[PDB]
Amino acid sequence: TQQFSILPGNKAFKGKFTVPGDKSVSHRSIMFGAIAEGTTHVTGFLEGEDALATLQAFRDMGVSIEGPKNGEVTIHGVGMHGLKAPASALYMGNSGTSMRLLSGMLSAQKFDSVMTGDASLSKRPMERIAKPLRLMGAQIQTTGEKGTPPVSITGGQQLKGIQYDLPMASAQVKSGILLAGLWAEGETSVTEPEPTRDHTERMLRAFGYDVKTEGNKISLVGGGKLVGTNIQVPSDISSAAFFMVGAAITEGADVVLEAVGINPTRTGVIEILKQMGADLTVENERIAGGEPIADIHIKGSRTLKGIHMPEDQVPLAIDEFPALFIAAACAEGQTVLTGAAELSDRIQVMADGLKIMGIDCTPTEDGIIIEGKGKSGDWSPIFAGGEIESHHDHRIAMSFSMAGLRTSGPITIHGTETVATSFPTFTELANRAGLTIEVSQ
């Protein structure tokens, strides 16, 4: 029942900011640090719902963990065989990611285990990860005809590597298979029909495990040992994207986003904004914890141009399109999104809010068409304001928050309590940049 409110008016948008840590990478560092040899020190950590569940599971399995505190975690790894049986069921809350990845890990252990979730997770099928694990010799049970949680795993099995053609692309199912393969006999291999994120693979390499990425075939050989290290979590590019868009639509904006993760499976938003004529540079590139990072410098030196968005960037920008829709509305000319059939109907929810603000747009079966109100060298308001329903989607809320940079009337966004969970410092950074957002309940 929380809401953001923004007043209209000309605003500045500038500064040097660092957004919160990537949630996937934060999570993987717990997964592998727990079973690695020696201690692992993590910095730039962000504890999301996935981290909390996994953190608790490994604590229940005997792992000593300090933090997180101020983004820092210390993990006293117990080695590949140092996990101890949990006294009761491992509660995963809403973390499907935790359940699917730990399915692979737990199916290789000596001890039995049961994974349970909240009301939402109890509805989600688990047979897409269970099926391949059982081919590896795992003893894993699901509930009912849809194979939903609880997931009951019998330990003491000897796993063997398989060559799996993944029916449906999924970083989670892929990861789960690979994790079981760490204990399996021989090589375990997953071939994915569509490209997915590879944070799991990159983190494994950081912990010293050999993982071959040969096109769409991803594989490893079991029997190795993970080695504790120092992990610097890159800042989340999905979070940075909102300020990239914000800078690109605000006259004379000058924003430097530091230590932004630029994993090639995540950088679609950069490529698209670049193709829209954005003044956006990527400099000071380096690698931290096996992840590539860079400083992003965005300037509102010119007006964005509407384009037919490149389809080859859609998988790489899937979460950032709500933000790009705001950019498109401010762009000069028409924008077209295609091949994004897999978008909560984020397209419909965005279209609804956009239409309220006076933007001509049209949801399509595989994307959306947006009639930009932008004009070159013109920085008059784009949005008329109004009251927005975010449907408790943090990306919808943060997107229309950026619209406050180019509005002629007040904006009120309902259902914003999930934003702080996803992006704790969002309103703080917005204010520091020159975008005042008032929060109320």
Side-chain angles (χ1 to χ4, degrees):
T1 61
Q2 193 202 77
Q3 73 191 37
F4 289 173
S5 71
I6 304 163
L7 294 332
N10 217 250
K11 314 199 168 77
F13 202 72
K14 65 184 64 261
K16 187 182 284 168
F17 310 112
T18 305
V19 304
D22 192 279
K23 287 189 189 68
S24 298
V25 180
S26 295
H27 176 261
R28 304 306 189 269
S29 72
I30 306 303
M31 292 287 296
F32 303 139
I35 58 168
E37 287 287 332
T39 70
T40 285
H41 298 268
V42 186
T43 62
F45 190 92
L46 183 62
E47 46 173 356
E49 288 295 339
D50 293 342
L52 290 170
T54 297
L55 276 168
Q56 185 56 55
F58 282 113
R59 282 183 173 123
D60 292 347
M61 285 187 290
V63 185
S64 180
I65 304 172
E66 178 190 325
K69 183 180 184 128
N70 297 113
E72 294 183 350
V73 186
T74 297
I75 307 159
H76 301 289
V78 301
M80 301 299 296
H81 308 284
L83 293 174
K84 311 189 204 186
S88 70
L90 305 165
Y91 181 70
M92 302 294 99
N94 67 287
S95 181
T97 305
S98 293
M99 184 174 286
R100 290 199 181 81
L101 264 61
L102 286 170
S103 290
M105 190 167 288
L106 289 165
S107 69
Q109 305 305 314
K110 296 170 180 148
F111 52 77
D112 301 344
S113 64
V114 177
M115 288 184 297
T116 49
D118 63 7
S120 55
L121 190 50
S122 292
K123 305 295 181 178
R124 302 186 176 287
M126 290 291 152
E127 280 296 316
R128 287 183 191 182
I129 178 57
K131 175 168 179 157
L133 287 173
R134 280 192 284 254
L135 289 171
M136 300 170 68
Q139 292 294 321
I140 174 168
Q141 164 165 24
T142 60
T143 305
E145 69 283 357
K146 297 202 179 191
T148 53
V151 180
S152 299
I153 293 172
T154 306
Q157 313 302 313
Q158 273 68 62
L159 301 183
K160 300 182 185 181
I162 58 170
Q163 301 283 319
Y164 195 67
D165 285 318
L166 193 52
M168 288 257 290
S170 169
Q172 287 178 36
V173 177
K174 163 178 61 162
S175 288
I177 297 172
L178 294 178
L179 295 199
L182 298 174
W183 287 273
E185 206 188 41
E187 166 177 306
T188 295
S189 164
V190 183
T191 306
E192 61 188 13
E194 300 291 352
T196 63
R197 299 176 179 194
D198 67 343
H199 297 299
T200 300
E201 298 94 295
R202 285 178 181 266
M203 187 62 73
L204 283 171
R205 294 186 182 101
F207 277 83
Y209 217 93
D210 296 308
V211 182
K212 292 201 301 195
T213 304
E214 301 168 311
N216 60 337
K217 189 208 183 200
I218 301 144
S219 65
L220 57 82
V221 177
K225 290 181 184 180
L226 295 166
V227 176
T229 184
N230 290 11
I231 298 289
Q232 180 187 358
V233 174
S235 67
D236 202 328
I237 189 168
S238 290
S239 295
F242 293 112
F243 286 74
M244 279 166 41
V245 167
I249 71 184
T250 302
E251 186 276 298
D254 194 335
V255 182
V256 177
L257 302 171
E258 288 183 306
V260 180
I262 51 168
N263 185 306
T265 67
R266 300 287 305 282
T267 51
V269 61
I270 292 169
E271 180 61 28
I272 293 168
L273 285 175
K274 270 178 147 168
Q275 284 187 33
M276 288 175 70
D279 185 2
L280 188 160
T281 64
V282 183
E283 300 174 344
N284 190 13
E285 308 189 23
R286 51 217 186 275
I287 284 170
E291 293 288 343
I293 61 176
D295 299 341
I296 310 300
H297 200 166
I298 321 92
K299 292 172 168 182
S301 62
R302 49 176 182 267
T303 306
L304 297 172
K305 288 164 159 26
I307 60 172
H308 179 275
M309 293 188 175
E311 295 188 341
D312 59 80
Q313 293 302 291
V314 171
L316 324 180
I318 197 71
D319 287 314
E320 282 65 72
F321 281 111
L324 290 167
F325 290 175
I326 304 299
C330 298
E332 182 179 40
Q334 175 181 97
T335 283
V336 180
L337 173 60
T338 63
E342 55 165 331
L343 300 181
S344 174
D345 199 331
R346 257 156 189 188
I347 292 186
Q348 191 58 257
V349 177
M350 282 299 302
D352 290 335
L354 286 170
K355 185 181 173 183
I356 283 170
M357 297 204 180
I359 302 301
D360 186 346
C361 59
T362 303
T364 73
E365 201 186 352
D366 72 336
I368 187 171
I369 299 157
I370 296 170
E371 299 294 346
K373 288 182 164 180
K375 296 177 183 172
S376 175
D378 188 335
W379 300 92
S380 307
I382 295 288
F383 309 97
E387 307 215 46
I388 308 303
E389 294 292 350
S390 70
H391 289 93
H392 306 272
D393 190 330
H394 52 90
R395 308 221 178 274
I396 300 292
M398 281 183 284
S399 290
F400 285 115
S401 286
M402 308 315 304
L405 294 164
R406 298 290 294 287
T407 184
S408 62
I411 298 171
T412 303
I413 302 154
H414 301 281
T416 58
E417 67 285 330
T418 62
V419 168
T421 321
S422 172
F423 196 158
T425 58
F426 176 77
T427 58
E428 179 187 298
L429 296 195
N431 271 263
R432 289 168 61 199
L435 177 58
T436 301
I437 304 174
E438 292 295 319
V439 190
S440 65
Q441 57 283 351

mmCIF file of all heavy atoms in Angstrom, residues 253-269:
data_model
loop_
_atom_site.group_PDB
_atom_site.id
_atom_site.type_symbol
_atom_site.label_atom_id
_atom_site.label_comp_id
_atom_site.label_asym_id
_atom_site.label_seq_id
_atom_site.Cartn_x
_atom_site.Cartn_y
_atom_site.Cartn_z
ATOM 1 N N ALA A 253 22.053 16.271 -18.816
ATOM 2 C CA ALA A 253 22.354 15.285 -17.788
ATOM 3 C C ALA A 253 23.802 14.830 -17.905
ATOM 4 O O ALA A 253 24.356 14.783 -19.000
ATOM 5 C CB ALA A 253 21.415 14.102 -17.893
ATOM 6 N N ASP A 254 24.417 14.518 -16.773
ATOM 7 C CA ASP A 254 25.792 14.030 -16.761
ATOM 8 C C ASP A 254 25.964 13.036 -15.621
ATOM 9 O O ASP A 254 26.189 13.424 -14.475
ATOM 10 C CB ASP A 254 26.785 15.189 -16.617
ATOM 11 C CG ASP A 254 28.217 14.778 -16.938
ATOM 12 O OD1 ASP A 254 28.537 13.578 -16.810
ATOM 13 O OD2 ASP A 254 29.030 15.657 -17.303
ATOM 14 N N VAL A 255 25.847 11.753 -15.947
ATOM 15 C CA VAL A 255 25.867 10.698 -14.939
ATOM 16 C C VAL A 255 26.968 9.682 -15.226
ATOM 17 O O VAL A 255 27.089 9.172 -16.344
ATOM 18 C CB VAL A 255 24.498 9.977 -14.860
ATOM 19 C CG1 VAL A 255 24.507 8.900 -13.775
ATOM 20 C CG2 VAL A 255 23.388 10.987 -14.595
ATOM 21 N N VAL A 256 27.765 9.402 -14.198
ATOM 22 C CA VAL A 256 28.762 8.346 -14.248
ATOM 23 C C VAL A 256 28.354 7.244 -13.285
ATOM 24 O O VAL A 256 28.240 7.468 -12.081
ATOM 25 C CB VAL A 256 30.165 8.860 -13.881
ATOM 26 C CG1 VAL A 256 31.181 7.710 -13.870
ATOM 27 C CG2 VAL A 256 30.599 9.939 -14.847
ATOM 28 N N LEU A 257 28.118 6.056 -13.833
ATOM 29 C CA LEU A 257 27.784 4.882 -13.036
ATOM 30 C C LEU A 257 29.016 3.991 -12.931
ATOM 31 O O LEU A 257 29.509 3.487 -13.940
ATOM 32 C CB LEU A 257 26.604 4.135 -13.662
ATOM 33 C CG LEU A 257 25.332 4.976 -13.836
ATOM 34 C CD1 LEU A 257 24.296 4.232 -14.648
ATOM 35 C CD2 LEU A 257 24.755 5.374 -12.481
ATOM 36 N N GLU A 258 29.520 3.818 -11.711
ATOM 37 C CA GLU A 258 30.788 3.124 -11.488
ATOM 38 C C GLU A 258 30.619 1.626 -11.255
ATOM 39 O O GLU A 258 29.634 1.187 -10.668
ATOM 40 C CB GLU A 258 31.513 3.726 -10.283
ATOM 41 C CG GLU A 258 32.102 5.097 -10.513
ATOM 42 C CD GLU A 258 32.860 5.595 -9.300
ATOM 43 O OE1 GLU A 258 32.268 5.607 -8.201
ATOM 44 O OE2 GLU A 258 34.052 5.949 -9.434
ATOM 45 N N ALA A 259 31.603 0.854 -11.709
ATOM 46 C CA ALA A 259 31.661 -0.577 -11.434
ATOM 47 C C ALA A 259 30.377 -1.303 -11.851
ATOM 48 O O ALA A 259 29.904 -2.187 -11.138
ATOM 49 C CB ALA A 259 31.951 -0.813 -9.952
ATOM 50 N N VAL A 260 29.801 -0.902 -12.986
ATOM 51 C CA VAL A 260 28.622 -1.573 -13.532
ATOM 52 C C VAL A 260 29.016 -2.880 -14.209
ATOM 53 O O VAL A 260 29.899 -2.899 -15.060
ATOM 54 C CB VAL A 260 27.875 -0.689 -14.554
ATOM 55 C CG1 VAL A 260 26.648 -1.415 -15.100
ATOM 56 C CG2 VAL A 260 27.474 0.637 -13.928
ATOM 57 N N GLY A 261 28.339 -3.965 -13.849
ATOM 58 C CA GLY A 261 28.576 -5.248 -14.484
ATOM 59 C C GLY A 261 28.176 -5.199 -15.944
ATOM 60 O O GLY A 261 27.088 -4.732 -16.271
ATOM 61 N N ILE A 262 29.073 -5.633 -16.825
ATOM 62 C CA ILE A 262 28.789 -5.649 -18.252
ATOM 63 C C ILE A 262 28.944 -7.053 -18.840
ATOM 64 O O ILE A 262 29.527 -7.231 -19.910
ATOM 65 C CB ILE A 262 29.691 -4.662 -18.996
ATOM 66 C CG1 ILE A 262 31.152 -4.901 -18.618
ATOM 67 C CG2 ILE A 262 29.270 -3.223 -18.676
ATOM 68 C CD1 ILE A 262 32.114 -4.189 -19.504
ATOM 69 N N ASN A 263 28.413 -8.046 -18.134
ATOM 70 C CA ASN A 263 28.340 -9.403 -18.656
ATOM 71 C C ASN A 263 27.596 -9.402 -19.992
ATOM 72 O O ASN A 263 26.488 -8.876 -20.066
ATOM 73 C CB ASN A 263 27.642 -10.327 -17.654
ATOM 74 C CG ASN A 263 27.644 -11.784 -18.092
ATOM 75 O OD1 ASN A 263 27.219 -12.120 -19.199
ATOM 76 N ND2 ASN A 263 28.110 -12.662 -17.214
ATOM 77 N N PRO A 264 28.198 -9.985 -21.048
ATOM 78 C CA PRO A 264 27.587 -9.914 -22.384
ATOM 79 C C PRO A 264 26.166 -10.470 -22.453
ATOM 80 O O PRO A 264 25.457 -10.165 -23.409
ATOM 81 C CB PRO A 264 28.529 -10.755 -23.252
ATOM 82 C CG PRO A 264 29.813 -10.773 -22.528
ATOM 83 C CD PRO A 264 29.474 -10.723 -21.072
ATOM 84 N N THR A 265 25.765 -11.272 -21.471
ATOM 85 C CA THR A 265 24.394 -11.788 -21.409
ATOM 86 C C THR A 265 23.453 -10.818 -20.690
ATOM 87 O O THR A 265 22.304 -11.162 -20.408
ATOM 88 C CB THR A 265 24.325 -13.159 -20.692
ATOM 89 O OG1 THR A 265 24.651 -13.001 -19.305
ATOM 90 C CG2 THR A 265 25.281 -14.155 -21.328
ATOM 91 N N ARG A 266 23.940 -9.612 -20.393
ATOM 92 C CA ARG A 266 23.191 -8.657 -19.572
ATOM 93 C C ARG A 266 23.198 -7.242 -20.138
ATOM 94 O O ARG A 266 22.500 -6.368 -19.629
ATOM 95 C CB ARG A 266 23.760 -8.617 -18.146
ATOM 96 C CG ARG A 266 23.717 -9.946 -17.391
ATOM 97 C CD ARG A 266 22.303 -10.309 -16.965
ATOM 98 N NE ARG A 266 21.681 -9.248 -16.176
ATOM 99 C CZ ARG A 266 21.936 -9.010 -14.894
ATOM 100 N NH1 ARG A 266 22.803 -9.759 -14.232
ATOM 101 N NH2 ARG A 266 21.321 -8.018 -14.269
ATOM 102 N N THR A 267 23.967 -7.019 -21.199
ATOM 103 C CA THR A 267 24.271 -5.661 -21.646
ATOM 104 C C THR A 267 23.366 -5.157 -22.770
ATOM 105 O O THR A 267 23.682 -4.163 -23.423
ATOM 106 C CB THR A 267 25.733 -5.564 -22.131
ATOM 107 O OG1 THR A 267 25.987 -6.611 -23.076
ATOM 108 C CG2 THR A 267 26.702 -5.685 -20.959
ATOM 109 N N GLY A 268 22.235 -5.817 -22.981
ATOM 110 C CA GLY A 268 21.337 -5.428 -24.054
ATOM 111 C C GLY A 268 20.896 -3.976 -23.981
ATOM 112 O O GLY A 268 20.772 -3.309 -25.008
ATOM 113 N N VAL A 269 20.679 -3.478 -22.765
ATOM 114 C CA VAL A 269 20.207 -2.108 -22.565
ATOM 115 C C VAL A 269 21.205 -1.074 -23.083
ATOM 116 O O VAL A 269 20.812 -0.009 -23.557
ATOM 117 C CB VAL A 269 19.918 -1.825 -21.075
ATOM 118 C CG1 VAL A 269 21.186 -1.984 -20.229
ATOM 119 C CG2 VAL A 269 19.327 -0.440 -20.905
#
